[PDB]
Amino acid sequence: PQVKFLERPVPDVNTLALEDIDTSNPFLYRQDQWGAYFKRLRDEAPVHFQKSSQFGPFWSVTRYEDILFVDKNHELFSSEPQIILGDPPEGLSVEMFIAMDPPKHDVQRRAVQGVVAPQNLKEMEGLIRQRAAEVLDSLPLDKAFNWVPAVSKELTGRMLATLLDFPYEQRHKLVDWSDRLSGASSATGGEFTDEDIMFDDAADMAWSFSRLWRDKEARRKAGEPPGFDLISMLQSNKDTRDLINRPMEFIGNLALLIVGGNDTTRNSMSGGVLALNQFPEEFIKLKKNPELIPNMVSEIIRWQTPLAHMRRVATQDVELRGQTIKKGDRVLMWYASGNRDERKFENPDQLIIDRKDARNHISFGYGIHRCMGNRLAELQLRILWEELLKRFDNIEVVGEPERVQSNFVRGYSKLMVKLTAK
Ligand code: HEM
Numbered sequence: 333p334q335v336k337f338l339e340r341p342v343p344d345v346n347t348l349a350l351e352d353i354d355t356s357n358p359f360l361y362r363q364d365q366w367g368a369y370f371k372r373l374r375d376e377a378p379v380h381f382q383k384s385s386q387f388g389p390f391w392s393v394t395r396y397e398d399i400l401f402v403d404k405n406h407e408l409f410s411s412e413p414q415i416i417l418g419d420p421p422e423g424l425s426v427e428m429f430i431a432m433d434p435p436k437h438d439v440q441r442r443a444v445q446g447v448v449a450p451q452n453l454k455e456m457e458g459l460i461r462q463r464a465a466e467v468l469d470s471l472p473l474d475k476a477f478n479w480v481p482a483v484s485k486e487l488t489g490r491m492l493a494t495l496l497d498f499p500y501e502q503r504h505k506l507v508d509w510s511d512r513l514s515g516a517s518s519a520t521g522g523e524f525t526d527e528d529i530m531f532d533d534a535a536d537m538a539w540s541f542s543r544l545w546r547d548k549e550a551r552r553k554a555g556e557p558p559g560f561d562l563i564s565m566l567q568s569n570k571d572t573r574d575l576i577n578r579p580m581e582f583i584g585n586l587a588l589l590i591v592g593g594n595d596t597t598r599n600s601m602s603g604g605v606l607a608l609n610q611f612p613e614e615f616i617k618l619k620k621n622p623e624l625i626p627n628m629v630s631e632i633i634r635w636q637t638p639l640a641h642m643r644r645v646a647t648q649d650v651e652l653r654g655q656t657i658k659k660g661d662r663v664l665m666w667y668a669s670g671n672r673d674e675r676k677f678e679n680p681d682q683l684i685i686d687r688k689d690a691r692n693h694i695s696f697g698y699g700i701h702r703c704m705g706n707r708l709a710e711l712q713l714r715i716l717w718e719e720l721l722k723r724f725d726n727i728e729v730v731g732e733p734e735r736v737q738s739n740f741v742r743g744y745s746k747l748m749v750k751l752t753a754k
């Protein structure tokens with residue numbers, strides 16, 4: 333049941349009773365209230381029950397420490413049946429291993445893990461660097477342009493096409509299908525309300541992925557050598573040779589990977605540019621010390637936290653910081669709060685590119701569901717920033733960033749950038 337969320341000014345959090353703070357509001361990030369809202373919960377109600385929202389009753393866990401406890405304890409806090417606050421559109425549910433408990437989760441993850449293993453990422457690195465070079469060489473100088481479509485959306489589309497060996501000139505479909513899956517109003521308070529186009533996406537996605545399998549199956553029978561892409565790898569491994577005979581698992585986990593990498597990588601790419609503009613000393617420091625890029629990528633991902641939360645269901649009664657979460661209660665782990673928790677990160681709101689524990693961020697989560705594409709994400713941002721510093725002396729954000737409506741995605745729709753050449 334899809335709802336067109338209407339933007340009302342969000343109240344100053346100090347003018348509310350604790351019981352009334354609703355973190356499911358998808359305009360908290362846009363209106364720059366998320367910070368104050370999460371600070372007050374961290375300090376006064378770090379394990380907080382909201383009895384009423386558009387999405388029903390849910391708990392918010394906002395302290396770094398408590399997020400680790402919940403994320404680690406998969407047996408107490410199930411990932412089934414969903415991993416977002418709300419529900420997917422009626423009859424348009426997709427079986428992803430992210431929304432799965434062991435042993436089933438482990439089997440499906442093992443089947444697909446190899447594609448983003450550092451060994452296989454080495455095979456792709458040259459192509460990802462080349463496709464990055466092309467886009468950056470195409471950008472206008474001394475002219476403000478929208479970074480989101482031009483670089484972030486573009487590089488992300490290419491990344492997903494590279495990974496799947498998807499028809500390169502149909503790569504916009506992977507972004508479009510991903511946006512409408514993860515941005516459904518019913519799931520995340522996103523802007524997407526049209527369920528007809530979502531049924532179209534399901535048909536278009538099941539067709540195109542079944543086609544890509546058959547095309548690769550033919551080239552292999554024709555004796556062509558297996559490539560570095562996911563379908564090649566799945567067709568090589570004997571467990572996943574007949575994966576097209578498990579259509580739920582096949583389309584589900586293919587959809588999971590594209591949803592997985594889409595907004596996440598894009599908003600990391602946009603977020604990084606903004607973070608270095610709001611903290612101009614960090615950019616001066618990055619240019620003098622470009623060996624900081626790897627750690628900066630960790631700090632950008634901590635600072636952005638592209639996915640605000642992940643949801644779980646208590647499998648039994650669980651005591652947590654003096655609160656009793658009841659069997660069946662929905663629990664949000666607010667990673668966006670944990671990565672700003674001064675109990676872990678001194679000066680948690682500042683971008684510090686040489687932050688020595690940057691890598692201890694929880695943007696990828698923690699435990700058996702820790703991000704499968706972490707290495708791919710870090711690679712793409714490292715590559716982006718290596719290629720940027722080669723070409724550009726300054727990256728100047730102009731005007732105000734426009735932010736996406738969601739309680740799940742922390743993203744940008746517009747980020748106006750002026751480039752200066754070296
Ligand atoms: C900045 C980029 C990214 C961030 C911030 C991110 C964040 C996350 C988070 C928070 C989880 C779940 C953690 C948990 O429940 O404990 C996750 C899982 C996952 N991510 Fe990512 N991710 C990113 C990039 C990617 C990319 C590029 C891919 C694939 C190409 C990907 C694929 C996945 C998959 C498959 C899972 C499910 C893991 C499992 O359930 O076993 N992610 N990611």
Ligand SMILES: CCCCCCCC(=O)O
Nearest residue numbers: 416420513514519591592
């Ligand atoms: C880690 C990426 C997985 C996000 C799943 C969102 C799909 C839905 O809204 O049902």
